[PDB]
Amino acid sequence: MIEKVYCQEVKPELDGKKVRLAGWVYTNMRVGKKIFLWIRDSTGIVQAVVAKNVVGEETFEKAKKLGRESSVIVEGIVKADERAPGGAEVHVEKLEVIQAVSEFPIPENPEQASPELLLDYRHLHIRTPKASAIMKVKETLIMAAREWLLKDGWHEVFPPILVTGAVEGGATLFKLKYFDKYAYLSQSAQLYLEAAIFGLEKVWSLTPSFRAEKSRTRRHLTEFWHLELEAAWMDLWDIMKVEEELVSYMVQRTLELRKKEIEMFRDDLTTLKNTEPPFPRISYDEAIDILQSKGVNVEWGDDLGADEERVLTEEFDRPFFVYGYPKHIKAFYMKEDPNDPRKVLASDMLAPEGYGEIIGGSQREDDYDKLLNRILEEGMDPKDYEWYLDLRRYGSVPHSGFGLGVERLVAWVLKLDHIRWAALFPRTPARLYP
Amino acid sequence: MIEKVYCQEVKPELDGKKVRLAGWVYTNMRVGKKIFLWIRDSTGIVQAVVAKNVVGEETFEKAKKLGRESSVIVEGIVKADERAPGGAEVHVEKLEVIQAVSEFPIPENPEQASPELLLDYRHLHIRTPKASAIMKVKETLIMAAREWLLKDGWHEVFPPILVTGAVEGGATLFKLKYFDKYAYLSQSAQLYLEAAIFGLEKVWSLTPSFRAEKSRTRRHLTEFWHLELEAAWMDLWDIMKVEEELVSYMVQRTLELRKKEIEMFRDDLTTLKNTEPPFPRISYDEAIDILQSKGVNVEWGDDLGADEERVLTEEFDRPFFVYGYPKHIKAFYMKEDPNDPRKVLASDMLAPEGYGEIIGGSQREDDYDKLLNRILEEGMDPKDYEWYLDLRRYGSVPHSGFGLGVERLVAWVLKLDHIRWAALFPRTPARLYP
Numbered sequence: 001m002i003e004k005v006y007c008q009e010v011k012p013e014l015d016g017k018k019v020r021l022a023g024w025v026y027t028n029m030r031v032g033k034k035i036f037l038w039i040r041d042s043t044g045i046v047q048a049v050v051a052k053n054v055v056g057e058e059t060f061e062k063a064k065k066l067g068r069e070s071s072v073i074v075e076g077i078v079k080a081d082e083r084a085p086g087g088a089e090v091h092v093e094k095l096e097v098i099q100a101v102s103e104f105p106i107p108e109n110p111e112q113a114s115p116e117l118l119l120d121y122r123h124l125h126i127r128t129p130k131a132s133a134i135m136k137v138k139e140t141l142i143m144a145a146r147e148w149l150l151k152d153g154w155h156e157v158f159p160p161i162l163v164t165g166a167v168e169g170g171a172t173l174f175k176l177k178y179f180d181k182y183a184y185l186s187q188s189a190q191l192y193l194e195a196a197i198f199g200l201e202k203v204w205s206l207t208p209s210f211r212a213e214k215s216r217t218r219r220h221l222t223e224f225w226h227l228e229l230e231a232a233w234m235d236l237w238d239i240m241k242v243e244e245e246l247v248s249y250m251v252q253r254t255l256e257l258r259k260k261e262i263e264m265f266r267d268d269l270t271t272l273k274n275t276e277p278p279f280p281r282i283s284y285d286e287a288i289d290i291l292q293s294k295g296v297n298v299e300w301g302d303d304l305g306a307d308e309e310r311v312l313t314e315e316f317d318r319p320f321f322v323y324g325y326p327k328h329i330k331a332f333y334m335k336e337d338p339n340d341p342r343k344v345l346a347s348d349m350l351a352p353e354g355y356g357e358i359i360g361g362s363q364r365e366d367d368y369d370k371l372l373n374r375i376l377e378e379g380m381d382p383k384d385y386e387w388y389l390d391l392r393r394y395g396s397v398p399h400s401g402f403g404l405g406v407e408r409l410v411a412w413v414l415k416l417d418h419i420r421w422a423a424l425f426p427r428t429p430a431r432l433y434p
Numbered sequence: 435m436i437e438k439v440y441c442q443e444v445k446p447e448l449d450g451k452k453v454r455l456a457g458w459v460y461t462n463m464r465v466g467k468k469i470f471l472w473i474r475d476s477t478g479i480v481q482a483v484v485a486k487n488v489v490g491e492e493t494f495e496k497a498k499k500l501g502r503e504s505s506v507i508v509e510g511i512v513k514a515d516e517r518a519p520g521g522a523e524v525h526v527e528k529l530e531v532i533q534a535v536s537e538f539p540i541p542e543n544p545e546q547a548s549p550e551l552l553l554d555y556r557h558l559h560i561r562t563p564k565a566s567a568i569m570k571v572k573e574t575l576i577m578a579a580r581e582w583l584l585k586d587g588w589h590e591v592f593p594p595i596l597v598t599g600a601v602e603g604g605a606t607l608f609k610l611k612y613f614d615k616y617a618y619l620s621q622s623a624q625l626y627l628e629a630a631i632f633g634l635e636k637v638w639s640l641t642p643s644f645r646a647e648k649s650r651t652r653r654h655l656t657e658f659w660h661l662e663l664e665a666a667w668m669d670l671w672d673i674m675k676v677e678e679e680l681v682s683y684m685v686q687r688t689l690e691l692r693k694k695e696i697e698m699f700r701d702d703l704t705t706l707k708n709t710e711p712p713f714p715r716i717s718y719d720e721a722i723d724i725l726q727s728k729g730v731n732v733e734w735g736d737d738l739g740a741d742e743e744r745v746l747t748e749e750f751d752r753p754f755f756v757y758g759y760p761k762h763i764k765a766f767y768m769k770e771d772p773n774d775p776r777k778v779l780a781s782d783m784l785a786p787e788g789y790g791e792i793i794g795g796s797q798r799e800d801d802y803d804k805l806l807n808r809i810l811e812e813g814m815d816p817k818d819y820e821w822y823l824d825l826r827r828y829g830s831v832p833h834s835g836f837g838l839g840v841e842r843l844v845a846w847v848l849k850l851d852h853i854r855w856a857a858l859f860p861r862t863p864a865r866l867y868p
């Protein structure tokens with residue numbers, strides 16, 4: 001390959017050097033007698049100056065016709081100039097038009113289009129600066145997670161997607177024909193991580209999880225990226241510490257690296273700066289009391305939906321935990337609170353600013369009889385979970401874990417109006433394409 | 435949590451120190467008047483010495499009954515002793531039996547069981563040393579990939595799994611009901627990576643890919659982990675360099691870190707040591723000539739199946755490329771060789787020692803008309819690929835990419851007899867459970 005110079009590399013210190021840009025036309029404007037093409041690539045935008053008396057009439061005329069997203073190779077000499085973007089521009093010697101474009105269907109400012117148009121053209125939308133910014137933030141949060149997980153001694157595993165068990169209820173299961181059998185798409189890798197702790201003790205996975213959720217909210221996708229941890233020996237309080245340490249490191253690392261991207265989306269970084277341990281912790285009992293005190297008609301035992309969480313966040317300026325939920329609005333696998341068996345040892349981590357739940361986790365039931373009984377009480381067939389029950393027969397240990405919704409976290413970090421914008425190609429009940 | 439000391443931490447230099455082990459009984463043997471329990475955890479095995487006159491009769495009797503996989507907490511004093519495993523043992527002061535076990539259904543040496551028993555009990559099999567070793571090698575190869583990808587300036591993206599397009603043919607597609615519509619499980623994220631290069635230039639993803647492959651071979655799963663790269667500006671030769679640099683770094687890094695694990699599986703590390711650029715490259719034409727020279731009844735235009743690849747590997751002592759395949763045994767998206775349009779600019783990377791294909795990649799067709807025509811020739815509906823065709827309308831650039839089968843790579847690195855052992859919970863046409 002003939003090497004390119006990235007836009008971010010075009011700096012005043014390269015004054016007088018030859019560079020080869022490769023990218024796409026961002027804007028095309030005649031300035032005096034010259035054509036100024038701003039060329040975008042993955043790293044920034046550079047001003048390329050095209051002079052008729054330098055490139056000749058043929059190239060000059062071609063340059064006039066280059067609309068947004070025209071693919072081009074540009075060779076020229078860098079000139080330091082305090083007036084140009086980045087304090088340096090390229091004086092064009094040669095212009096190769098790969099493909100001229102005049103009708104790119106995403107507007108120059110995407111937010112002047114209907115969100116439905118942007119989704120119809122999601123494959124084109126993702127190359128635009130804000131959409132690309134979201135993907136850079138996403139990769140950085142995940143890289144940060146992997147740094148923390150490696151340093152803290154967790155093992156990465158690669159759990160199954162095709163499964164036969166519901167982890168998070170039958171209502172959100174996708175079912176498919178699988179040769180002579182039927183399979184489900186995994187809602188969560190948790191049950192498999194629980195098997196894996198017996199060999200590896202501290203495990204984690206990042207997998208797509210699948211939820212056939214009919215409700216079309218701004219916090220639900222039908223497919224999302226799910227970062228999940230499970231650890232032998234740890235109780236609920238232990239796993240909550242892991243959660244706050246991990247989330248804080250993810251947020252602080254992304255603040256350090258992606259400030260520019262975050263500032264495209266936020267006027268106020270306060271809640272992100274505030275994201276360091278210890279996070280505030282309230283019981284579900286306290287949550288009910290707070291909600292009732294603000295006039296919300298909620299009763300002990302009621303589910304905390306998105307609206308309840310939203311009101312609860314008003315009292316917090318960083319992520320916070322709610323723990324000790326009523327047993328019967330919580331998953332079959334969660335351990336009872338031994339001090340109060342009406343509750344389970346579960347906690348959710350809620351993001352502030354109205355965002356609500358980003359992590360759900362718990363200590364797991366480690367007693368065989370108790371777990372079997374919960375399976376039966378929930379109308380589940382123990383046959384489908386015999387392997388999971390085996391984990392309580394062959395050297396059971398106390399253990400706990402959690403799942404973080406990556407898109408949910410990105411949506412809070414960037415104050416997105418909908419979780420769909422944090423997925424590369426979002427999936428919702430009416431959206432499968434592109 | 436009360437902190438534990440890991441087995442690998444029990445070293446002669448801790449002589450006289452109190453430690454708390456937490457783990458599972460590996461073996462239980464009476465030695466003289468004492469009970470020797472070898473305790474395994476995620477990091478190794480430690481000899482714990484239980485003396486009746488120290489722990490008392492009740493604890494001593496309990497210790498006699500502890501079979502393999504009994505979950506235990508052991509507190510005691512480290513004693514340096516050249517005779518013990520690791521040169522240090524723990525003299526037990528306190529023994530807490532969490533759960534006693536006497537009938538763990540995986541044999542002490544798993545390979546004395548039918549592979550079908552091991553798969554029936556896959557959830558139990560994975561905690562055993564060799565199976566756990568494979569997972570450590572897998573996480574290390576992947577960590578190595580991420581190190582290389584970050585250093586070389588690639589962006590991580592998180593592409594969709596629910597899709598409407600076949601990338602790699604209709605025959606291996608899983609189809610499912612999706613609300614009022616139908617969806618497919620992604621065979622490969624490639625088409626979406628191609629969309630993503632327009633914003634991010636150099637992209638990669640690690641995703642589960644799904645192949646409804648009826649043939650039950652030792653190189654096919656119905657679900658596998660697929661590491662895929664796509665890059666703007668790069669041609670086939672460029673992407674081949676990326677492939678050899680990445681694979682070499684993965685292998686060399688895993689050799690550096692996981693020598694102990696690899697030596698459980700290999701007598702000979704030669705081919706791994708040999709895995710550094712430049713890898714040997716032969717044309718498909720040369721491959722046919724080699725095969726015919728060894729008496730294989732293959733003709734130019736024929737598909738190279740597993741058996742052909744196996745024979746071809748006899749001539750190589752490290753991974754190697756085969757390039758320039760006949761157009762009509764290759765995918766619809768691949769770019770024709772401009773020098774010879776009977777061929778496409780595709781290459782596979784084959785592992786030696788009979789293993790064969792670990793990567794398939796190509797330069798992509800970047801001409802709209804040519805791609806449309808190939809879609810139509812293959813009996814595909816261009817409507818299902820309109821978005822993919824858009825990538826050839828709105829600033830097309832030359833580009834290339836590839837997919838690496840992680841399990842396929844693990845199977846070669848560890849000389850596994852079947853790819854299934856490199857998946858945490860393998861999926862094959864008759865195996866969906868556990």
Ligand SMILES: NC(=O)C[C@H]([NH3+])C(=O)NS(=O)(=O)OC[C@H]1O[C@@H](n2cnc3c(N)ncnc32)[C@H](O)[C@@H]1O
Pocket residue numbers: 167168187188189190211213219220221222223224226228229357358359360361362401402403404405406407408419
């Ligand atoms: N390993 C575990 O302990 C996780 C546990 N099995 C689990 O799946 N919990 S969860 O349903 O709360 O999902 C966990 C998180 O996953 C996110 N989530 C959960 N459902 C969705 C949907 N439908 N869309 C997007 N994101 C979703 C959200 O952040 C939740 O807090």
Ligand SMILES: NC(=O)C[C@H]([NH3+])C(=O)NS(=O)(=O)OC[C@H]1O[C@@H](n2cnc3c(N)ncnc32)[C@H](O)[C@@H]1O
Pocket residue numbers: 601602621622623624645647653654655656657658660662663791792793794795796835836837838839840841842853
């Ligand atoms: N992004 C790309 O350019 C990849 C391209 N779309 C692709 O899917 N190619 S491939 O079919 O050869 O699959 C790529 C690799 O994926 C592996 N593979 C491909 N199929 C399987 C099955 N069924 N089981 C396990 N592993 C499999 C094998 O290592 C192949 O070399």
Ligand SMILES: [Mg+2]
Pocket residue numbers: 304
């Ligand atoms: Mg809830």
Ligand SMILES: [Mg+2]
Pocket residue numbers: 348357359360
């Ligand atoms: Mg939840």
Ligand SMILES: [Mg+2]
Pocket residue numbers: 738
């Ligand atoms: Mg082939």
Ligand SMILES: [Mg+2]
Pocket residue numbers: 782791793794
């Ligand atoms: Mg192939």
